[PDB]
Symmetry: C3
Subunit: 308 residues, 3 copies
């Protein structure tokens, strides 16, 4: 019933910078003002203040493992608190590595939740199969149960508890996956929808199946982790890893409009909005408004109209 | 069998200006020259000359109610004359408020026609539920029978006669509807196809249903009122109310190509082309050529080729 | 199992110039370097050196009939040699008129191959029904059996042997067909998929049918002749005959990804990349990378990932 924006302007997740300005842009985009305008109430948790672990030594390859392990541990702590009160937790953040704290904290109250991860990537690189070391590409690794133990524990993420099985997570939009990640998902029979399947089935049937897969038997809580680079660059240019032939505005919306319809949206995740990475101030607006549009959608803003 | 372009460079419908240049752009785009090249004959009625009602006092909120009531009254007068002769009336115009005279005049000869209103809006705001007062958003209100009487009669539109029921009109492309308009359409069980339904069913099935709904029982005449902002801004940027995630070139065409196939196209409506509103001369070309493409399409120009 | 790039920087096919730089751009785009990175081996045949027939007198209308007849005769000669060794022949070339030597040479080793011609055109103009005389629009004419004899034999193409029936070729993407070409395809009951059919069925079903049509009975070798202007100009602007409302990146790929899946790709054809025709160096990159993406795709580069 209630909503709670938890700013998470973290950044250490990846090399490029400018992702901590995300909650700023979105909020500056009047996000909370339009969201209240829905048949929901909104409590802004305000942005979190992350402590930066000194002499953060790159564990093996993994850059900033402590700082990141920590800033995340803090989010889960906070995400678990608001969820514990029965509120949908929208997390305005920086890089997807902050999905570690989001989900975990969410998973702590509802161990049986499921994940509809929308992104053009899998972010399932273990600190081993990972080329270079930017955690914004390892989330699913720290969370998947079937993966724990298959890589060296990282300094600062021990607090985590693999909380979801491969039968609880579904991917949508994939188009730029690595050899390792591909292996891992294939090896674990994870249900996904690469842009190939979409092009084939049409976003319409993608949801019917994503839903008949995750909510077929039981009807548990849903954790939507929306990565902005999931929608074609023509719509979300202000990101770090833009990939053409992606999801469109109308698709990103059919996805959110459908998640609303279920009535199970428990925890959202709007990540990767990088204002700084806009070739023109316009690109940052196109990204910020369709990031917001998406949010509002998850809360009822249908495209056919909404009367009180 | 014959066609008749009726320029309608009216404008008072909305605030922004530059819509009276539409028939000029379109015609300047060699519209009539390519249209003749079809298996049809074309008679250009030339642009209408609209009298501007002096001291046009904003009735309640409704801006320029007289001037607009009048310019429209004139169109119907003219649209009824050419229709009365058995000719398909293409109306190159300014704002959609000129759809009042178009349909009315059309409806006068064929009371049983039906409407396939393609636009990203509903234009069903009554002079009451309407925020601000630009008639380019009230057409469907002056025409729907079920609505007459539910708002103060406006100075200059009395001549109108609500000529169509909610079972005679279908919407295609909707994406930016108001609370009032949404209420009204929902309250009147009007058949519509928001971008949601499209994304789901795919433009292909949208037509089969729009057709099985309007022409299921009888096979009456069709009045296509094509609003240019119905196609994504990426295609029709030169408009006043651009809304992302709209109909694409290929969709606007499948729509027209299908209407041709029925063989019932009686009266067309190409509205909202605003040359002035192009950030670059290019945007006005992209709008003018795909506005034309659309027209030609309504007349047989299939995408698989056309041999004499 | 093995692949062999055969540069074919020919050009005389059409008026505009800059198509011989295609193999240069593509290769310069690291085409062969990424292609080897597949589960395939690659042998670059290097670019061909075409002799230019002196005093090439425009036979009737057909411009440069000798030069073109010859440069093509050479390709078939070469395409037949590598195919004769059991290698998939990718032909980096200029204008589609070089598809004459490609297919012919291919057809010589496998007379029973079939053609999936992806383009926005039919290239089936006979030296008679053809307006102006640029052979880049007559290929299918020199190859179709049902057409041989219906036009004056051309100086330099006699070596050709119509090698495919209208039941062996399928079209995908059509949107700008002439009166003659339309006639000819209609008159010969050729299976095609104009952008209309795509918009209706969705690229997904287009392949199931293109496949159930050509590979229904027997499962013969496939000859994909990919014309770059088959994908909307927004993706392949660097061509000579750009036509809006075309195939998109995701569609061009679903097409290639599917052809890979069959396992019958015998001979490819990447034509019409014109570096010179890019309004901005960017347009030439957008064209060269999605031309390459396409190639890679035909060889296994799925969008869900590829692990060794
Ligand atoms: Mn991500
Ligand atoms: Mn991503
Ligand atoms: Mn309108
Ligand atoms: Mn509109
Ligand atoms: Mn071609
Ligand atoms: Mn072509």
């Amino acid at each position: 019933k209630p909503i709670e924006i938890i700013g998470a302007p973290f950044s250490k997740g990846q090399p490029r910078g400018g992702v901590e300005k995300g909650p700023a842009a979105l909020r500056k985009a009047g996000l909370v003002e339009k969201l209240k305008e829905t048949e929901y109430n909104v409590r802004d948790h305000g942005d979190l203040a992350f402590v930066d672990v000194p002499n953060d030594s790159p564990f093996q390859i993994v850059k900033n493992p402590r700082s990141v392990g920590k800033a995340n541990e803090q989010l889960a702590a906070v995400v678990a608190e608001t969820q514990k009160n029965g509120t949908i937790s929208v997390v305005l953040g920086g890089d997807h590595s902050m999905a570690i704290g989001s989900i975990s904290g969410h998973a702590r109250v509802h161990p049986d939740l499921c994940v509809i991860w929308v992104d053009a990537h899998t972010d399932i690189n273990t600190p081993l199969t990972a080329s270079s070391g930017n955690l914004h590409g390892q989330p699913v690794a720290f969370l998947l149960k079937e993966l724990k133990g298959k890589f060296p524990d990282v300094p600062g993420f021990s607090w985590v508890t693999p909380c979801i099985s491969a039968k609880d997570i579904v991917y949508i939009g994939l188009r730029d996956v690595d050899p390792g990640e591909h292996y891992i998902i294939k090896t674990l029979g994870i249900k996904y929808f690469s842009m190939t399947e979409v092009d084939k089935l049409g976003i319409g049937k993608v949801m019917e199946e994503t839903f008949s897969y995750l909510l077929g038997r039981k009807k548990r809580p849903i954790h939507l982790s929306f990565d902005v680079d999931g929608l074609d660059p023509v719509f979300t240019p202000a990101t770090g890893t833009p990939v053409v032939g992606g999801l469109s505005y109308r698709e990103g919306l059919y996805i959110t409009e459908e998640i609303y319809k279920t009535g199970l949206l428990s925890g959202l995740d709007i990540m990767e909005v990088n204002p700084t990475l806009g070739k023109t101030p316009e690109e940052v607006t196109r990204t910020v408004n369709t990031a917001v549009a998406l949010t509002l959608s998850c809360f009822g803003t249908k495209r056919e109209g909404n009367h009180k």
